[PDB]
């Protein structure tokens, strides 16, 4: 018999049933893609693209669909806020249905390859035994991969035939699927440059086509063939797994640090954008530029877009959720319905205090209001029986200069303390916590979930590659050395 952890080894020396199980896995993955897309379309709310975007709704595969071109659905809506033009066959639901039909076709092909496994194509003509010319198969596959890479980089993303990719504002205000001109200079290696993706795919496709032709025409040496066990499928398994978790570590890194292939409007903001004050600095720069030239306060802040203030909010932080805080970000702290405004605090005699913002490491943070120079002037104290920093004796007042609260000044009650505590989380926003029966604790972004899943899978596949490389270098002792 066989152990439960060895039942898949029956197709090691069976190329036809290996193709069958690869087709079965491929069918399962395509069917998951279609079913997941249809689930996210069913649970998606496209009413508010600005204040309730897809990354706030826990959408996982919709940002990846969007990134390569599909924007509108069969329901007549588009994620950009525009009402849909003709979607053709390639909408969200159309792509999902195409994946489902592909899954069924791959299932049927898997059944055919399971039944018809003893094909003469898998038989060696020289010896009659079953064998695979793995260097030639690799050359063919590398040629096809280079052709796909070159086509995707020269026709799809450049827009000469395809739609392009998602290009957005540096602060994620305006973004859309557009054609992208390739960047062939050093700027093409800028990770946030969208032009580096078509140039990369064109050059890598050309080089992959050349290397595939080289492997098609040139046989490996005997020393390298015996050293890497090129006649064995377990060795190529180990090498392929190695390349796969290398790519998994790379995609997890680019996911966590952001890139041109990782739009903010699709995957949410970044924890480094929160820590480094990206949106906060841009908001303050816009307010300073408007106040220095013309427009005064309470009308300059009205020039601040609703989306930027939503980006400057720690509840949108991907490094703020929990491992078992499951679900959408809306289910965490409600659906955002409006921006209350910029809470500005003044002393009793008059000087602008600032609430110290919460870092990502802190589940909770003390509420302090400190001076322009950098000295603590007030706080919401824990002990409430000492010093000259409690709110009720410093006498700070919150003014607000935004949407729902534009000139409503509060000075006396504990509403000042409540607004200070809300201001330590960034821009104060109004949330509806009754539609989804929201929890209260912050959830994680799809960016954070993608990064966690891929890093965990990357280490697990490091172990898998180490085990498989062990097994393919040590085949003689894993099977038996026969008393020698």
């Amino acid at each position: 018999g066989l152990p439960w952890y060895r039942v898949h080894t029956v197709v090691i020396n069976d190329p036809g049933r290996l193709i069958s199980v690869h087709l079965m896995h491929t069918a399962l993955v395509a069917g998951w893609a279609g079913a997941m897309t249809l689930f996210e379309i069913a649970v998606f709310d496209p009413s508010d693209p600005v204040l309730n975007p897809m990354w706030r709704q826990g959408m996982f595969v919709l940002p990846f669909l969007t990134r390569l071109g599909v924007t509108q659905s069969w329901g007549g809506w588009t994620i950009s806020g525009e009402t849909s033009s003709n979607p053709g066959i390639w909408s969200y639901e159309g792509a999902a249905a195409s994946h489902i039909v592909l899954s069924g076709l791959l299932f049927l092909a898997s059944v055919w390859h399971w039944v018809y496994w003893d094909l003469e194509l898998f038989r060696d003509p020289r010896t009659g035994k079953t064998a695979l010319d793995l260097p030639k198969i690799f050359g063919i596959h590398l040629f096809l991969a280079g052709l796909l890479c070159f086509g995707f980089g020269a026709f799809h993303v450049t827009g000469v035939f395809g739609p392009g990719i998602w290009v957005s504002d540096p602060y994620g205000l305006t973004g859309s699927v557009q054609p992208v001109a390739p960047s062939w200079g050093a700027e093409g290696f800028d990770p946030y440059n969208p032009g580096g993706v078509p140039a990369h795919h064109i050059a890598a496709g050309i080089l992959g086509v050349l290397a595939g032709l080289f492997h098609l025409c040139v046989r490996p040496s005997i020393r390298l063939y015996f050293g890497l066990s090129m006649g064995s499928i377990e060795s190529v398994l180990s090498s392929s797994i190695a390349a796969v978790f290398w790519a998994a570590f790379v995609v997890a890194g680019t996911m966590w640090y952001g890139s041109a292939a990782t739009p903010i409007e699709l995957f949410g903001p970044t924890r480094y954008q929160w820590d480094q004050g990206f949106f906060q600095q841009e908001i303050q720069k816009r307010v300073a530029q408007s106040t220095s030239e013309g427009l005064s306060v309470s009308e300059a802040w009205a020039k601040i877009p609703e989306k930027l203030a939503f980006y400057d909010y720690i509840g949108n932080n991907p490094a703020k959720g929990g491992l078992f805080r499951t679900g959408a970000m809306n289910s965490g702290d409600g659906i955002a319905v409006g921006w209350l405004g910029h809470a500005s605090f003044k002393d009793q005699e008059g000087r602008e205090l600032f609430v110290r913002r919460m870092p990502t490491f802190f589940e909770t943070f003390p509420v302090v209001l400190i001076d322009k120079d950098g000295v603590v002037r007030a706080d919401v104290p824990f002990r409430k029986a000492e010093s000259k920093y409690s709110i009720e004796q410093v006498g700070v007042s919150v003014t607000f200069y935004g949407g729902e609260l534009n000139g409503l000044t509060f000075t006396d009650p504990s509403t000042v303390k409540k607004y200070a505590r809300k201001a330590q989380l960034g821009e104060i926003f109004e949330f509806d916590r009754s539609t989804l029966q929201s929890d209260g604790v912050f959830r994680s972004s799809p960016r954070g979930w993608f990064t966690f899943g891929h890093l965990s899978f990357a280490l697990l596949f490091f172990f898998g590659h180490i085990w498989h490389g062990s097994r393919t270098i040590f085949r003689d002792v894993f099977a038996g050395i026969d008393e020698d």
Binding site: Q276, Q280, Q281, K285, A288, P359, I370, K372
Partner: peptide
Amino acid sequence: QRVRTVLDMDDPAKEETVKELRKDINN
């Protein structure tokens, strides 16, 4: 506009800002 004021404007709320961590030798 006022790069000195906006740097001090973001000074109290957040000490990890890029605008602070760059060109901090002159301060």
